[PDB]
């Protein structure tokens, strides 16, 4: 189990692979929305975060992230 | 008579490239033989002083042992001259990568040509000069007497009013660098006046150096096409043997 972000030769190899440009590559993804169409629970208001670009933090209203599910992954 | 026409003289400027087909084994053997001859020439030059008798005798023995062309015989000299030509071209192909290798190759070739020229008869020198592209100019006797004192004072291997029975040549000052460097020639309005022996030796050496440098630079553009699977181990081994 590895938790790169969020709240041993094998570990080092996996860590190196997960950050090399061999994985971070352009792909073609066929996805399906995780929240099923039948489900109904719209209750999400916009959040507020503190992005800082020029050593000058500012506040913006951000939308909740999009959750997907994979069905097929192909190279290109 | 293709045999004598192809190789009429022991001395060469290596202008015409070879055009026949040879086996791989002879190719490798010629390359190895010429690199050994070059190393032997360098060692003999460093150990002894250029000239003398022991140095030239050992050089002659080395040339004879490696079945090359050094002397002048009327019968059966096609093979040594052909081997010298092909081996020199192969070594030129193999020695065109870096500046240091080019400088070393040019130095050794110049020394070998100087020796072969020093062991040549006079009429053979004149014929060899005619055969190659060089053309020289001889000043008139009136000019010779007009500038006798200056030439004798410069003393280009001339002592005691030895200007008589000699031909003085007129050449641009950019070609007599060896003599021009250390005040051994009389310079006037952009031309150098040189006696016969010094002019032939030094000017032939300098012209050969310039031509060989230009041709090696031209051949440097070639090995980008030498992707042949053969000749590659030979070139790699010979580069850093």
């Amino acid at each position: 189990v590895l938790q790169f972000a969020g709240p041993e030769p094998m570990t080092m190899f996996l860590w190196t692979l997960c950050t090399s440009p061999s994985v971070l590559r352009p792909i073609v993804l066929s996805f399906e929305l995780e929240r099923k169409p039948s489900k109904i629970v719209p209750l999400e208001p916009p959040r507020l975060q503190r992005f800082q670009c020029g050593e000058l933090p500012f506040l913006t209203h951000v939308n909740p992230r999009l959750r997907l599910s994979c069905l097929s992954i192909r190279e290109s | 008579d293709q045999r004598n026409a192809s190789y009429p003289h022991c001395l060469q400027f290596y202008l015409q490239p070879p055009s026949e087909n040879i086996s791989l084994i002879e190719f490798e053997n010629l390359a190895i033989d010429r690199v050994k001859l070059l190393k032997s020439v360098e060692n003999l030059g460093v150990s002894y002083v250029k000239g003398t008798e022991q140095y030239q005798s050992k050089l002659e023995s080395e040339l004879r042992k490696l079945k090359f062309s050094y002397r002048e015989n009327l019968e059966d000299e096609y093979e040594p001259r052909r081997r010298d030509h092909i081996s020199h071209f192969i070594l030129r192909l193999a020695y065109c990568q870096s500046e240091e290798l080019r400088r070393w190759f040019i130095q050794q070739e110049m020394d070998l040509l100087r020796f072969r020229f020093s062991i040549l008869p006079k009429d053979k020198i004149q014929d060899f000069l005619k055969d190659s592209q060089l053309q020289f100019e001889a000043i008139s006797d009136e000019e010779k007497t007009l500038r006798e004192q200056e030439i004798v004072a410069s003393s280009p291997s001339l002592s005691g009013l030895k200007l008589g029975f000699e031909s003085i040549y007129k050449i641009p000052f950019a070609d007599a660098l060896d003599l021009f460097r250390g005040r051994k020639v009389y310079l006037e309005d952009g031309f150098a006046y040189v006696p016969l022996k010094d002019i032939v030796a030094i000017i032939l050496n300098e012209f050969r150096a310039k031509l060989s440098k230009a041709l090696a630079l031209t051949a440097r553009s070639l090995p980008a096409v030498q992707s042949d699977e053969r000749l590659q181990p030979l070139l790699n081994h010979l580069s850093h043997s």
Partner: protein, 419 residues
Amino acid sequence: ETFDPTELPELLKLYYRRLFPYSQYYRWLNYGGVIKNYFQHREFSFTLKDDIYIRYQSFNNQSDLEKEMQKMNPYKIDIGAVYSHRPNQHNTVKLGAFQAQEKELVFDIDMTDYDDVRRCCSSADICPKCWTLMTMAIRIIDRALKEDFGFKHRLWVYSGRRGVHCWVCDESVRKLSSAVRSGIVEYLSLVKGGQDVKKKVHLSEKIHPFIRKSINIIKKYFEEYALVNQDILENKESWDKILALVPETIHDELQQSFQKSHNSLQRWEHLKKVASRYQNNIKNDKYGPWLEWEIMLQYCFPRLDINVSKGINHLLKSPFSVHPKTGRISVPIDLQKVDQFDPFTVPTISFICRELDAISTNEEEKEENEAESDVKHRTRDYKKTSLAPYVKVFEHFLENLDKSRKGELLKKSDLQKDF
């Protein structure tokens, strides 16, 4: 007047704005445009304020060059060699394909190569007594390069403090390789040896014509400069150090003769007589038969630097610069009047700025209601100041170069037989 370096920036700005001859500079550095992209490849290297060094600089045309010097106001300007690509874009070419091709042959002469021969000044100072050294050096080098070699166009530039440069800007000279330049420098040298060697000149029995003519040139200046002004035989230490270059068998005789002698002229005559007498007894001796000529060569011959001329990508100070310490102008030297050239009379930047101010004040009442371009204003400004004869000499040299180019073009047309 004493130069105050704290006033340098304003005078520098005014000089680069109004008095610097951009037109003649671009005319010289272009060579008529016979070859495409010649000035676009010339490499400059400026030194900004507070010792900031930047090289690999190039410009597209005269206006860009004017704008760049006006904006940056450099303290020093240098000229490099012509490359195969624009120097400011030297990283956009595969390594090994960016090499210097052409540069005019140059020479350098300095005081610091005479501190052990001269005594009138101290260290890095100059007095009207020691400028005869540069006069003789100029004459010797110019005669050699004009007769022995045959180089037509030459420019002699006062370095500003203590030296003179020589810009040989012919057509076939620019294409010479490094080996030929090193050969030339070796051909033009006699004083050879390190610091630990006392006798730095060795003359053989046979005398080269170049050395003979140099000696004949030296003799016209040697007496007044050496015996009268320098007084190289005044004290015990003087002839003691001179005695280091004479045969060891006549030390006591020469010392006794010098004690008998009174002035420097008498000592020189006694030395000449002693050398002449000893020359008849020379039989396989280390010392040659030319002691007097060897002494003259050691005490008067110029010494050149091989590093300045051997390289093909070297840098030298450009003409019409400003010395950061004294504040003079690298003015061209006229060859016809090289004897009358007084280094202390070279106009300073402050003096020419004051003259420009006076000229503007006069123009406030003499030249009014004229809507002329800035080019004509700068032309008048540098014409009416003390800088006029030097730009005239520069123009004469440029005219000679233009005549040579026209003659070469005419010869080429004659070869083509088309008119």
